[model samples]
Target: RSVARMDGDVIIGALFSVHHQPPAEKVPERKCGEIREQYGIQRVEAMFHTLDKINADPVLLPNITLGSEIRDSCWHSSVALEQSIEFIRKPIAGVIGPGSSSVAIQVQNLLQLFDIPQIAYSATSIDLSDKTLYKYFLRVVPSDTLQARAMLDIVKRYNWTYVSAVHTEGNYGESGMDAFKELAAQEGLCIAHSDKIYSNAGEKSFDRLLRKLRERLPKARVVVCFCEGMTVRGLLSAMRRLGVVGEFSLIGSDGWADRDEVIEGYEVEANGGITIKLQSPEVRSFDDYFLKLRLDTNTRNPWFPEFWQHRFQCRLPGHLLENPNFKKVCTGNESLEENYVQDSKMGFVINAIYAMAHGLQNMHHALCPGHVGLCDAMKPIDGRKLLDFLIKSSFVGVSGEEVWFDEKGDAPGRYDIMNLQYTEANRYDYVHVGTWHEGVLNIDDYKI
Candidate 1:
């Protein structure tokens, strides 16, 4: 379901992958077999919560109360294009997200027509940072180029001259892994095998790929997966089935490590795996609000009930036929904190919203000076002016770090190198092993 708040004159558009609906699936059949991405919903809540914070603060907006219209991209470029057009038809001041870099690429093509500024929370394709191409597009997350460099740093530090890579068939993985391959060659690293797999590929195809990987494992123990979490999950499942465990050293891009749920069952296989992840600090209030989310008739979030049912393994009342997979009824006693873990990148989402809000506030001041009341004259604020302010926007964010865009409309490349370690008794957690900043990796030595 799409969320729309029509309080303020200026409306900001938000696009998120609310549900992972396959491309072949139609709209009416969307509810069935739709995989709800809780991480995207968490980011949605963060955006709304940021709006609440901005509206409540007198210093931020003064008399301006920003409105918002949010839609689900489904993580597909075609769907994202449609949703972006819907917002473009409305009085959209600026756009946020369409998380996947591939989707952002498609949506930005259309958004460029209207000159609408798009501030992405997650889309990190190096292509999006091309100022001449995407002048209005800005991302809070660093480009995949930086992540590729970090992966090379790890590869070089470990003195692995030969490595293999697997990426998802999309702009995010394809372009990122391509950059990594080019850089690896420059660093004198030999590519044993490089391939890609679709996230939704069948078990038969994945198994065949695993067999080929089993052959490559002995030759190149180091393998980098520059793909999304879904793709990694499918690959790991196939790897487990093939019993190809502990034979290869896995180096992953940020996409595969964004959400903990994505790599849930593959911890043992991913044990000691090194991945560069976006820097995220704990935001206490965001998690507090996320824990209270529940399904109700008035709630505009259409996917929450589906997510709730899946998270708690129960069905909601009056919808047993809709969800025949779940045998039990929802007790309504499930807690998000206990049952599901929130994505740490929620801070980036909040920061993205605040960035847009601050930009809009600055634009408001420039358009109407010394006006405490409503500015009917400047009512439907200019998109170009808003974008200009957005380009110059800067502030300290919830992460306790300075938030600002570079000349190319990208953020500073700051990442954490996390090693997924198993302690004891079937328990495992991510240990911060190092930091990556401006092509330099400050890491502790590891024994391979």
Candidate 2:
């Protein structure tokens, strides 16, 4: 409930993959109305942080007050569609996310019915770039079409001929891997195996995938995993259980690259893994505020307490008797800084909000230039007009990068080649091994 106004002057719709069903052994059984938010909490907070940052600035939106209804898609297409419909029910001017590309595609299709402008913070599927299909849809992140080339560039640089490819069972993986396969064939690289996994898959699914890799992937020790971060974790978990550690090299897509927490326990198995990641600068202001978030019952997000309980291993006052799992009492002294989760996508989220704000500002200036009060705050703005400005708007984002959409509604940008290597004291870190610019990989082994 990061509402800036009760009667929202201009409301924006935002959806996030805040919760998803993980592998059986990875998390506790989710209760009836509960969802695990470990993977997405920080990104969700980024949306709120960005909104607050915008509201605080008088120059950004002028007199317009922006508000939103942030919903969790649960990383499911069905759930994303439902939340998106709810957003349409409200008088929303624009929409922000549905992080997964599959969910974004589903919602993007439905959003066309209303002709509402939408921008995604994380979705990178190549299919969304079709102007005829998704005219109003845009993204702050680069498309997988370029990401596939980056991945292939990594493979070519290493001169790997045989490799196994594991991808998530959705458009994000399907299209990305399709591009990889197309490029691999042209480059004369032979695919050892190409497999798919569901985000909602169980241990049995992972076991079957592990069994196939164990039996067929003995000769090819290089694996190219083109899936989301959670999918990579599930695969690594299954591999670790099967005692498949350090016997293979992995070339990863940007989805799970530089996200060390995804492969926490199985770092040994994922050692020497290379991945292409979105190049972004760390915003310490957001980090400071994020570390200060508390579990106040009066807060807008009701799930904050649940997340706090899970994160701090403590119980609230009323739930103390109902839940005996936690021994610690509610002190409210705990901090997110102690166990910080790195949100690499915060800059993108901030840029998404700024993009919308700038679009609205430009639209206002075009419609009502001098007399700012004549902008008609009560009347609903035109989506097509806003989108026209959105596509053409350009500004320096909080990440200190120039943010603007290309003709295809995709952001053209460079990527970092993050090499996951072992550090001191059984820890791991992402070393900037190279950079990908204009489809060329500038490799530097000594930097890592």
Candidate 3:
């Protein structure tokens, strides 16, 4: 028996439909636990990006009505999350988390009815609070507040007392920049030139921001970049245009790290400036794992990128031999890129799904006897109780690590504040600075 998970877009559509008119009459939903044991494995996967295909203008959706672009950019990640869930939900080994910038808001609403727990991988809006929905909701991504603090840590260290700040002209960038500015002020850092820029339009607009930077703050020492990866490249291109390469340093939020645009290319033509990314180390670990897993396989097809439809094909007996390099990259790396911010091991996501499966499997043992009713096993122990169980768990899985949840249901690990710098070879390196454990806060200046 295997678990049955739903695509995030479907869940979002269902919930939206409910809001329009409460579900015709609450159809009895199944418990998440019962479905797992029947299959002997947990099952969960999701897909939210499909929402992009649904709404004519994603911004028009009621969820964001206020800011459509931010929601649009992040929608694909939700799809990625749900796709992962689809695998296990079949056997009662998994649950689903709807994807949206309004994750906290939407999740809070979902919990009022279901018992499945969810962890947001890239959701980082201040409006979304894990504290308010501590149960069944966990996030590997940190909020704008933590991200700003991380930037401040580095700014103070470089003695970058005064600087210019340019953010993507939207809620995500503006809000984060505001918080970061406040922290800089408190730490005796000053903003010489600060304004918002249009980075979503890709490179052209990005270059414009750099031109504006030179015209407005040519002498500025550092740039607090609150933009996404695409914009970062634009900014880099713009910086290069000004010929002021290596002149300024950059402090980025969590979104700044793990950006394929920056990491994929090692050249820092922009500002030739150094960048200090503020993100969770766990996220970096996960990236490394995927890269390793993708390359190890010598199958006629590449990894998920090429055969996404076969994600659920199930790893047969030769699955290991078929993709030895993929396994090694994921399991072999000791450190992620420089300036790692969080400890998000890709293995954790897999383990979390497995744990959900394990929970469902136990339920199956109690009711179905042997892999029966697996699809309808999701039950009622959701909310904080579920969070409580996950936060304190120490499940052992194929990765060989004991998985545990924190008070917030985040995977069992601390959030690290790392320093990102490029070596002579020009590759970014993540150096550790501070940590967040069990809600205990520690301070560190980014000098290290």
Candidate 4:
């Protein structure tokens, strides 16, 4: 129930995987795991900052103010489903995110029933693109269909006909892997071993999964991993635990691309990983706004206090002093200066918000000509009518990409190749090796 609420004239909803999924035994309490900073807080704050930015503008919503009710999707569909019910309870016009495709599918299945628009920032499962199943769902990121083809191209580029494949067990992984399998067979590519693993199944299960891949290691030197952040990290952790270093080269999907959280501690095992991510450029203003936040002025975000404490590993002054959990006391002046890297899909989040705003703006123009605020027709804000505006949206994102949707409500596919290269033995950085757009694949000869 850690929902963040921001009040304005019109209220929308947003979902982020703010916490890791709670274990099955802990599900009854509805408790989520710790704060997922990279994927969670950063994205949540991005939305918050975007809302503030949009509201401050004179044109976007005009006299109407846009507010939000944020929920933690917890990277699991079940948890996301529970949080999604709140959108119905409140006066939410639309929804912005739920990063996992597994979670996105479950929420879309629910939201589509009411013709509510749900625009995703990261969910890339090919299954969501089926117009029949998802009528009102759209995403800023590309479909895994393009992701699959690009991955197949990478596989073909190296002539690694016989390879291994591991995908996280869910809609994102299942649908993506299925697409890759279908197209890869068309190109006469063969798989040495292909399997799915649950990201939350712990490192022991990952060890078992690795052992099976190790059997084919001699023939399959490369493993195409269609996995989420934790799943890839689990494999790396398992590799390190089993003392199996540099045995397999990983070609990862968008889930692992440009994510430091995935390889933070297991850098050595993940040194040679090449991953794909939707082309996202940094938004300088968001970084400026986020890094300059003071605890006192950040009262809008319900989770900022929690995010602050968890991030710095320190306790604040008052309620925290009742039971001091940490050695350091926060002066509310602890700087976030070191966090230069923005969230991977921050620009996309901004685009999603603008899409929602533009949809509403267009609706207002048509529904009430020359009107400033909500008219009688827009009083309740008909989500069904607003969907068309979103479908035909045309706007320039902060990254200069045109934000639009096709018949299936999916954005055009464009991706960047990110390779994990080691600087020091235990430290590493992501190197841009190539780019993929639509059907074209371009790998940098020198960068590769």
Q: Which portions of model 2 show Cα errors greater than 4 Å?
A: 1-7, 22-39, 319-325
lDDT of 1 by residue, 42-141 (tens): 7666667778777888888877787788787787766677777787454887888887888888888888888888998788788888978788899888
- What TM-score fits each model? 0.93, 0.91, 0.54, 0.96
lDDT of 3 by residue, 1-448 (tens): 1212232211221111001111212212311111110011110111212222223343222221110101111222232233333322412212333333443345444443455555554445555445564445655444667666666665565566778887765556766778887787776776787777654444566566666666665568577776655456667666666666765667555445444435444355432233333222233323433233332342322222212212222222334333222322222222223332222223333443344434433444544454424333334223334444444445564345555545644443334444455656756655455654444444465345
* Predicted candidate 2, C-alpha RMSD: 3.3
The runs of at least 3 residues in candidate 1 whose Cα sits more than 4 Å from the true structure, single-residue gaps closed, are 1-6, 23-37, 294-302, 319-322, 373-377, 446-448
List lDDT for all candidates, in order: 0.76, 0.76, 0.42, 0.83
Say which candidate scores most in lDDT: 4
Arrange candidates, best lDDT first. 4, 1, 2, 3
- Candidate 4 lDDT over 146-172, as tens digits, reads 889899998888778988889999888
How do these models rank on TM-score, best leading? 4, 1, 2, 3
Best by TM-score: 4
**Better by TM-score, candidate 4 or 3:** 4
> For residue 371, what is the lDDT in candidate 2?
57
Off by more than 4 A, model 3: 1-116, 130-136, 140-144, 168-175, 197-199, 241-244, 258-260, 270-348, 351-448
